[PDB]
Nucleic acid binder design. Structure first.
Ligand SMILES: Cc1cc2nc3c(=O)[nH]c(=O)nc-3n(C[C@H](O)[C@H](O)[C@H](O)COP(=O)(O)OP(=O)(O)OC[C@H]3O[C@@H](n4cnc5c(N)ncnc54)[C@H](O)[C@@H]3O)c2cc1C
Ligand SMILES: [Cl-]
Ligand SMILES: [Mg+2]
Ligand SMILES: [Mg+2]
Length: 496
DNA sequence: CAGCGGTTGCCGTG
DNA sequence: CACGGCAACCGCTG
């Protein structure tokens, strides 16, 4: 007899789920599992937004629905995997455990443990690749032992390898339920809790909802206009667009695996086949899926990837320890509306357009504050609903000119940048209510408004909104000089 | 045995 | 529409 568990971590979907399909073959009972640490939020050292947490829960609710509609259901087991699995293996009489492979530093530790624990209860463990497009261990082997370090050579490499695998077949229409009278599988014990029930006091303000169904819905919303998909160029999108965001906002879905990377890709190749004049990497929409892939690939094969020290791809830079600047940046009180609006959108939505991420990330690091990119990653990690270990680390290294990118004099202006997309300040007005009546002339630089305009608007600097914490021209030049010196030093160490 | 090309800056100038 | 400045970048290509 075959009794299996299909363990969800990422890959919160039924489509393109090889791990699910293998867990269903010749099976008497399948137990769909999500393991939930109930004492997660009480581990003081790191914080998590109710926005990210609830997005997960909404996705788990979407899975529960998908399984009820096929006879089975989702089991939200409470505890730590290394505790929970040993019991339910023995209890449920488990022969097989299937999950989607996960290349993150922590997931490898966790999965090494669960594999050992499976062996000690006679449990077979099958873990297909399906979160990334390719098997990244393969991509590295094919390149000769090391992950590419430029996108140009990465694009060649995947062209050589060929198209990523197709999305897997849709799963069974009806599924074997779990065996009845198993106390760990009791519906009173295994329900999907609400944000209230896990101990959050403030409600989630985000406009994007979790779940496979939303994910596929938003996928169809994107392919509504195949002209747009074919002609997509990432640098030409608008970071001020909030009502109709100027990119797909598939990132939260791809992060949790509500959407299948391979499906999205497969759908792009269909469109590109019918529109031969389509955009190419690195700017194309496929290019964006390959950016994700490129950073998973390098990130997963690089020691200490999410830190500066001991990271072989990362420039060693003299970043200042500066809590007042960091705290101001974090708390959306830098006194530059463009920045503060973005960092407020971060907190209230958990998503901003990439160029808005560029604005605030540059400003923290080499642009203005000279604070370590690690501190910025930590803030994003707390708030982003699409927060992804490797992509966040990689992009923070990119924007601080620490890896992948080294033209550090290309500093974004916190005044001018968004001004050219949104000169009325509709984004600033949306996310900084306090400036809602400040005339457009001064909305990006309210310290330049004369005191009468401030009082009329209902927004006096130093009272209703903070004064800018630095002079951009002085500070950005100060930082450039520091980066130049830091590059000279690591040029001198290199000859050794 | 040294170039080619790079997802997303900006200002002052002519 | 395009340069020089910032200050001298760098991995990949046989
Ligand atoms: C400092 C910083 C931190 C970031 N942190 C994250 C993060 O934690 N998680 C995250 O998913 N993205 C991150 N990004 C990348 C990018 O900002 C988002 O992936 C993108 O804005 C999401 O919108 P979208 O899905 O509409 O992208 P689209 O332009 O529609 O692209 C489609 C998909 O391609 C992938 N993609 C797009 N841009 C990038 C990129 N620069 N790097 C890697 N993959 C990409 C995403 O999975 C995305 O859903 C970060 C960028 C910066 C500068
Ligand atoms: Cl130039
Ligand atoms: Mg060239
Ligand atoms: Mg000028």
């Amino acid at each position: 007899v075959k009794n299996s568990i299909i363990w969800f971590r990422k890959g919160l979907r039924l489509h393109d789920n090889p791990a699910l399909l293998e867990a269903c073959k010749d099976a008497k009972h399948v137990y769909p599992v999500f393991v939930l640490d109930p004492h997660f939020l009480q581990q003081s050292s790191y914080k998590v937004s109710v926005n990210r947490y609830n997005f997960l829960l909404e996705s788990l609710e979407d899975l529960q629905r998908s399984f009820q509609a096929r006879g089975s259901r989702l089991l939200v087991l409470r505890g730590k995997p290394e505790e929970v699995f040993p019991r339910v293996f023995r209890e449920w009489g488990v022969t097989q455990l299937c999950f989607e492979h996960d290349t993150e530093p922590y997931a490898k530790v966790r999965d090494a443990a669960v594999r050992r624990l499976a062996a000690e209860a006679g449990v077979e463990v099958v873990t297909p690749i399906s979160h990334t497009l390719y098997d990244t261990d393969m991509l590295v082997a094919r390149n000769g032992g090391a992950a590419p370090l430029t996108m140009q050579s990465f694009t060649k490499l995947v062209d050589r390898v060929g198209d990523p695998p197709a999305p897997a077949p849709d799963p069974p229409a009806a599924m074997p339920p779990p065996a009845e009278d198993m106390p760990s599988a009791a519906p009173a014990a295994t329900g999907v809790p609400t944000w209230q029930e896990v101990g959050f006091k403030e409600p989630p303000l985000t406009v994007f909802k979790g779940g496979e169904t939303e994910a596929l819905a938003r996928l169809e919303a994107a392919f509504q206009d195949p002209k747009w998909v074919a002609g997509f160029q990432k640098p030409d999108t608008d970071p001020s667009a909030w009502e109709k965001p100027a990119t797909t906002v598939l990132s939260p879905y791809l992060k949790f695996g509500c959407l299948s990377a391979r499906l999205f890709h497969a759908r792009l190749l269909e469109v590109y086949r019918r529109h031969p004049a389509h955009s190419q990497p690195p700017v194309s929409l496929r290019g964006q899926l390959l950016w994700r892939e490129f950073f998973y690939t390098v990130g997963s094969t690089t020691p200490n990837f999410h830190r500066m020290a001991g990271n072989p791809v990362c420039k060693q830079i003299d970043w200042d320890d500066n809590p007042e600047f960091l705290a101001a940046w974090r708390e959306a009180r830098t006194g530059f509306p463009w920045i503060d609006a973005i960092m407020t959108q971060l907190v209230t939505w958990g998503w901003m357009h990439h160029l808005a991420r560029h604005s605030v990330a540059c400003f923290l690091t080499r642009g203005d504050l000279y604070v370590s990119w690690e501190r910025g990653m930590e803030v994003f990690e707390e708030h982003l609903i699409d927060q992804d270990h490797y992509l966040n680390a990689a992009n923070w290294m990119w924007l601080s000119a620490s890896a992948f990118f080294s033209q550090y004099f290309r500093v974004y202006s916190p005044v001018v940048f968004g001004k050219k997309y949104d000169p009325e300040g509709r984004f600033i007005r949306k996310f900084l209510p306090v400036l809602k009546d400040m005339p457009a002339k001064y909305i990006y630089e309210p310290w330049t408004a004369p005191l009468e305009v401030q009082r009329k608007a209902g927004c006096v600097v130093g009272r209703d909104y903070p004064a800018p914490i630095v002079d951009h021209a002085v500070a950005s030049k100060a930082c450039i000089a520091r980066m130049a010196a830091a590059y000279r030093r690591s040029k001198g160490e290199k000859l050794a």
